[PDB]
């Protein structure tokens, strides 16, 4: 009559008029994390609504979660705050919240040979 | 809530052998010292 | 480094990788560093100490041959360096034919990686023991809060929850307790292993069998 | 060399036809060093070993968010909740 | 307490076809599935097929299919047996067994299948020969008998067929030192044997001796002196 | 007459799909390698024991093994379950019956209810005086033991009826082999495999290894020494 | 199925341990073991791979493990002179033996004593001939036949020899039969049997 | 009340047994033993290193 999981809760059900088998999945739930430079620099703030999908909630989807209010730039500069998934935001250049793939140092092609 | 306290002093008590097996077994063979203690002045026969 | 590979990984990473292996408010945050960026530091760790020796933690890379490299680090455990320069054939020799052994050593043994498999299964052990607590009664007369609030008005209602409260705050203030000190010992692991790093890779170590036993080359 | 752990320096292990058996546990080869006051070992050759070192380094970032944990959904539960504060 | 009593021993021609059978006492015959087995000159043994003695199920082992057959009567106690179109290889110990007693009556208490019980074993023999009585050829140690030299001395008994021979000294008045080999078919296709007395010829049982030798499936008797 | 048991009689202990998962249940179940009295239809129908319940099993030529009857003295002072099959048809009473000096099917009711190679498979329990019946019907080469196996026993029947059942009886067809097992409270852990089928089960109570699987949750154990109890 | 050793034997007082293997084709505790003296019918000694029959002594064992069962005689009898099979069986009916294991108690080394007979005249005069070596009071029962004129002759298909059949002596013997006709024997000025033993 | 004592796995006697051997070690062979063989050299050589 019922699916179960580890806490002794239903995993699924069978419905009982038309008896098909329906799994339950949680209704999508997270963190709201508020990135923020500090007050004394600006007012401005993105939301990280984590772990989520952007439908469910300039948005832009990352492994994190959906983030909100933070523009994405190709670019690539040093992790100023932390978002995870190695995206990293910063209040940059008419400065806003840009969000970036963090940078982990200038490359260098080391002038090696015998 | 008991089997994981059974659990975690379990933990602690293999930790306990690891603790010391590292600090002494070091040494791969038993090392032994010869019959005659010509150590050059040496005497070490306090702590051997 | 694998150029062949969605993720740049050397070989020897991907044997690593390999062989390592609800949601009732449970989540599990991303790293910072992704793993194809963990495996960028480590290859320019490696790049670094190929193509410089120890010269790329004091300041700029400086290249160097990597035999004159050896030669260095011979002179460093007190062999002349004509010992390498006269041997090198058989120098390279064995540590070709060794870097061959830890492959077939990784291949075969899954058992190997045991200090890392047992993180992820004491944390995971951790997990499973926190879900399976919300199954307990601790002395209410369901451990279903749902049917609770189906079955009882709430008067009689509290006296049930207050129980479950009870017991799901001890539960979580046990895991979190034993998290606490959990990251303490891998906090520790990981100083030593940032030691290592800075010892071990970024110079070569005096240390006696702090970076495998013998005399530390590299 | 101990292969199951049992205490007090006994250990066991499965062997020949096969058993469990029990045993107290060998530390090592005994190996008197070959000393005396005008001799000594240098050796004439060598091998470069590569040994593995595995350390773990971080651990599952993991949150539980209290409230969804213990009560979930429950208005009547996190009400109650709120009276055990910080 | 449990008895299985088989038919005497049988011989027949390769292509031919045999028949044995086994009588059974001592427990409600019907209650233990019935087992026929094989086994070769001194060798391990192999299942042939079982029947329900309560309900004739038969089934057969692979090695013998369709070459045997099996059943089984409630009236009489007893179980049957054919193997047809005989081979030299079907010269063996054959036996009746059961497997599955509700009480493994004097055997043990809780039951597992096994075997509960056996025959006496049936003899059989397959061969291209013909009933023949033996030829006796009396037998001395190195070149012509001496008395001292006779400490084995004996005959040989050849080329008889089917089994038994047996044989006996002095008419029977000597057993002490007697030795017999074991019957071996010869390549003629008939069985052979030695028998011998390990004592010189220096008592009044041995400045002569005879072998006794005798055959049952002719009633032949042979008194073969020795020297 | 005895048999054994082998791993025969676990059965799905409650209405719940699981799957890829080992669950500790504990429950009454036939324990494992326990022996299993055994007895005849023909070539000893007596009353017997329920205890605290009966696995009752049967290999059988067709049919020959009918039905059941339960009860304390089976002399009409009390109601008494009957449980019968004729030809496809299950048929149900508990009525306060007089049942004859030998009880066959021949070749006050407060509950009534109808819907060589056969192995036959029951479990009866009656917690609280509720008469749950599980089962499992299997192909079986040979009629003359329980077969060494394993085989899960679904759910059948609830039968809410409240009878203080201690002795049992069968029904069979009068003008071959029938087993019975008793129940004991035990840990078991059930291995349920990917379509949620029990396909294995560990005896926690068996043997030290068998405490050692179920310490560990685990049918396969690796090498070690495992706390697996407290003696006193 | 696979069973080991072929023969066994050591001193009385002591233990004799046999192998029985398989596929998991066949079932794990539908195993049991048959002791058989030579010329008897088999008997029964241990089933559910660890059982015994009942009034079996109880210095007969057995046991297993996963692919590998066994069966112990421990306390070695002048009564373990007997071949030894295993059987299993599974679902699918299938009462399956194994090779069969010729358990023995260590006895005293002793070399053959030999002795050879060249033909009677009688047997000459009846057109035939059968030249008869014998070999006995030996142990281990190993002992071995190479017919000789005096060179070699062993090579002649005509040849043939029992087995070493067990004596009152606690000791083994065979005969070998070289059978020539009168023409084939006549052959050859003398005729011997040379024995190997231990060496 | 429950409480039990484990013994150690080495014994008291097996600890004092591999300080022993690092005594043993550390007085015939220096540092060497650690690297690799148990290289002897003369105390006062290895003193004087
Ligand atoms: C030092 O040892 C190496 C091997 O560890 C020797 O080089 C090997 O010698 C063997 C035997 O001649 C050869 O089969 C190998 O092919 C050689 N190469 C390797 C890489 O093993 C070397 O000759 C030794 N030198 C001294 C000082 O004896
Ligand atoms: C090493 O030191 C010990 C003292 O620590 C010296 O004395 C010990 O050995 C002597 C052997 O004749 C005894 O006479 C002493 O009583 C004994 N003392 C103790 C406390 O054990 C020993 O002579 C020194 N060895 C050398 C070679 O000088
Ligand atoms: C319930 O009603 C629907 C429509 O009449 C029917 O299809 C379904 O089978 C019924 N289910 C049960 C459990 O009776
Ligand atoms: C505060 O912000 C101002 C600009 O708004 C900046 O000049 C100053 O350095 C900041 N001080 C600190 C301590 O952040
Ligand atoms: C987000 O949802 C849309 C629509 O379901 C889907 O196409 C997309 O792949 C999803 N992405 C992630 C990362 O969940
Ligand atoms: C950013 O990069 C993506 C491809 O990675 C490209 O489609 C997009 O046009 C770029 N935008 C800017 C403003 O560079
Ligand atoms: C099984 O029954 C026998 C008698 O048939 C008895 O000796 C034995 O102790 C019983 N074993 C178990 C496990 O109950
Ligand atoms: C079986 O028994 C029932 C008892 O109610 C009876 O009605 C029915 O006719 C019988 N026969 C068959 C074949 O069902
Ligand atoms: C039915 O119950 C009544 C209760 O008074 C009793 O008299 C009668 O004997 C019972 N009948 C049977 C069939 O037991
Ligand atoms: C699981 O179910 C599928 C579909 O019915 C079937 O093919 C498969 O064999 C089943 N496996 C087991 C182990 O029962």
Request: net charge negative; glycine share 6%; charged share 15%.
């Amino acid at each position: 009559q019922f699916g179960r999981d580890i806490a002794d809760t239903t995993d699924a059900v069978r419905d009982p008029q038309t008896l098909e088998i329906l799994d339950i999945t949680p209704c999508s739930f997270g963190g709201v994390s508020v990135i923020t430079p500090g007050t004394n620099t600006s007012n401005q703030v993105a939301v990280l609504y984590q772990d989520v999908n952007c439908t469910e909630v300039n948005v832009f989807q990352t492994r994190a979660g959906c983030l909100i209010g933070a523009e994405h730039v190709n670019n690539s500069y040093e992790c100023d705050i932390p978002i995870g998934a190695g995206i990293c935001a910063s209040y940059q250049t008419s400065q806003s919240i840009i969000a970036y793939t963090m940078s982990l140092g200038a490359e260098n092609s080391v002038a090696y040979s015998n | 809530f008991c089997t994981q306290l059974n659990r975690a002093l379990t933990g602690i008590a293999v930790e306990q052998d690891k603790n010391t097996q590292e600090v002494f077994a070091q040494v791969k063979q038993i090392y032994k010292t010869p019959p005659i203690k010509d150590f050059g002045g040496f005497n070490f026969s306090q702590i051997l | 480094p694998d150029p062949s590979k969605p993720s740049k990984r050397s070989f020897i990473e991907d044997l690593l990788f390999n062989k390592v292996t609800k949601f009732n408010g449970l989540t599990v945050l991303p790293p910072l560093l992704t793993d194809e960026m963990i495996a960028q530091y480590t290859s320019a760790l490696l790049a670094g100490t190929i193509t410089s020796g120890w010269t790329f933690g004091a300041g700029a890379a400086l290249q160097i041959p990597f035999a004159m490299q050896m030669a260095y680090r011979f002179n460093g455990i007190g062999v002349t360096q004509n010992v390498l320069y006269e041997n090198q054939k058989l120098i390279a020799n064995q540590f070709n034919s060794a870097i061959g052994k830890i492959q077939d050593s990784l291949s075969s043994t899954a058992s190997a990686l045991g200090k890392l498999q047992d993180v992820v299964n004491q944390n995971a052990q951790a997990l499973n023991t926190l879900v399976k607590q919300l199954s307990s009664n601790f002395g209410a007369i369901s451990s279903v809060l749902n049917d609770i609030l189906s079955r009882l008005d709430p008067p009689e209602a509290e006296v049930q929850i207050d129980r479950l409260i009870t017991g799901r705050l001890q539960s979580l203030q046990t895991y979190v307790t034993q998290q606490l000190i959990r990251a303490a010992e891998i906090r520790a692991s990981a100083n030593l292993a940032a030691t290592k790093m800075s010892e071990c890779v970024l110079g070569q170590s005096k240390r006696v069998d702090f970076c495998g036993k013998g005399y530390h080359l590299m | 060399e101990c292969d199951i752990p049992i205490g007090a320096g006994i250990c066991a292990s499965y062997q020949t036809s096969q058993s469990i058996i029990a045993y107290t546990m060998s530390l090592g080869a005994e190996n008197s060093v070959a000393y005396s006051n005008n001799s000594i070992a240098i050796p004439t050759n060598f091998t470069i070993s590569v040994t593995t070192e595995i350390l773990p380094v971080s651990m599952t970032k993991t949150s539980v968010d209290c409230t969804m944990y213990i009560c979930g959904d429950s208005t009547e539960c996190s009400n109650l909740l709120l009276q055990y504060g910080s | 307490e449990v008895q299985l009593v088989e038919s005497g021993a049988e011989v027949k021609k390769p292509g031919a076809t045999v028949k044995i059978s086994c009588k059974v006492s001592g427990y409600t015959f019907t209650d233990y599935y019935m087992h026929w087995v094989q086994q070769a000159p001194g060798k391990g043994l192999e299942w042939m097929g079982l029947v329900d003695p309560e309900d004739g199920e038969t089934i057969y082992a692979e090695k013998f299919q369709g070459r045997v057959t099996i059943t089984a009567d409630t009236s009489t106690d007893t179980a049957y047996m054919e193997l047809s179109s005989l081979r030299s290889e079907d010269t063996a110990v054959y036996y009746c067994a059961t497997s599955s007693g509700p009480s493994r009556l004097c055997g043990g208490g809780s039951c597992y299948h096994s075997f509960d019980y056996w025959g006496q074993g049936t003899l059989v023999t397959v061969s291209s020969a013909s009933t023949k009585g033996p030829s006796v050829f009396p037998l001395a140690p190195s070149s012509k008998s001496t008395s001292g030299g006779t400490a084995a001395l004996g005959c040989l008994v050849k080329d008889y067929f089917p089994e038994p021979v047996t044989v006996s000294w002095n008419s029977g008045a000597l057993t002490s030192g007697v030795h017999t080999f074991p019957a071996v078919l010869q390549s003629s296709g008939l069985y052979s044997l030695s028998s011998v007395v390990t004592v010189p010829s220096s008592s009044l049982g041995t400045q002569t001796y005879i072998c006794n030798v005798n055959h049952k499936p002719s009633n032949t008797k042979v008194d073969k002196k020795v020297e | 007459a005895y048999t054994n048991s082998f791993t025969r009689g676990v059965y799905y202990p409650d209405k719940v799909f699981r799957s890829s998962v080992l669950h500790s249940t504990q429950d009454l179940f036939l324990p494992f390698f326990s022996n299993v009295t055994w007895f005849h239809a023909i070539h000893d129908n007596p009353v017997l024991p329920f205890n605290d319940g009966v696995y009752f099993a049967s290999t059988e030529k067709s049919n020959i093994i009918r039905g059941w009857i339960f009860g304390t003295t089976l002399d009409s002072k009390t109601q008494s379950l009957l449980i019968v099959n004729n030809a496809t048809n299950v048929v149900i009473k508990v009525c306060e019956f007089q049942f004859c000096n030998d009880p066959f099917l021949g070749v006050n009711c407060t509950f009534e209810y109808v819907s060589f190679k056969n192995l036959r498979e029951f479990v009866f329990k009656n917690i609280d005086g509720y008469f749950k019946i599980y089962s499992k019907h299997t192909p079986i080469n040979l009629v003359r033991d329980l077969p060494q196996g394993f085989s899960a026993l679904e759910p059948l029947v609830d039968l809410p009826i409240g009878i203080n059942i201690t002795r049992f009886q069968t029904l069979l067809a009068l003008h071959a082999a029938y087993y019975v097992g008793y129940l004991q409270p035990r840990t078991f852990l059930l291995k349920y495999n990917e379509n949620g089928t029990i396909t294995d089960a560990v005896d926690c109570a068996l043997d030290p290894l068998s405490e050692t699987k179920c310490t560990l949750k685990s049918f396969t154990v690796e090498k070690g020494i495992y706390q697996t109890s407290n003696f006193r | 199925l696979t069973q080991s050793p072929g023969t066994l034997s050591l001193s009385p007082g002591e233990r004799a341990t046999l192998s029985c293997r398989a596929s998991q084709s066949v079932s794990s505790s539908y195993l049991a073991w048959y002791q058989q003296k030579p010329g008897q019918a088999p008997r029964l000694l241990i089933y559910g791979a660890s059982s015994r029959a009942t009034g079996i002594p109880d210095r007969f064992s057995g046991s297993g493990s996963g692919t590998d069962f066994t069966l112990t005689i421990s306390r070695l009898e002048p009564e373990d002179f007997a071949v030894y099979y295993c059987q299993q069986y599974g679902s699918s009916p299938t009462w399956t033996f194994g090779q069969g294991t010729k358990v023995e108690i260590k006895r005293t080394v002793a070399a053959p004593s030999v002795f050879i007979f060249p033909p009677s005249d009688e047997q000459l005069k009846s057109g035939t001939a059968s030249v008869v070596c014998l070999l006995n009071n030996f142990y281990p029962r190993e002992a071995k036949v190479q017919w000789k004129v005096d060179n070699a002759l062993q090579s002649g298909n005509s040849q043939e020899s029992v087995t070493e059949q067990d004596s009152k002596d606690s000791t083994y013997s065979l005969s070998s039969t070289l059978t020539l006709s009168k023409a084939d024997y006549e052959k050859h000025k003398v005729y011997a049997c040379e024995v190997t033993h231990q060496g």
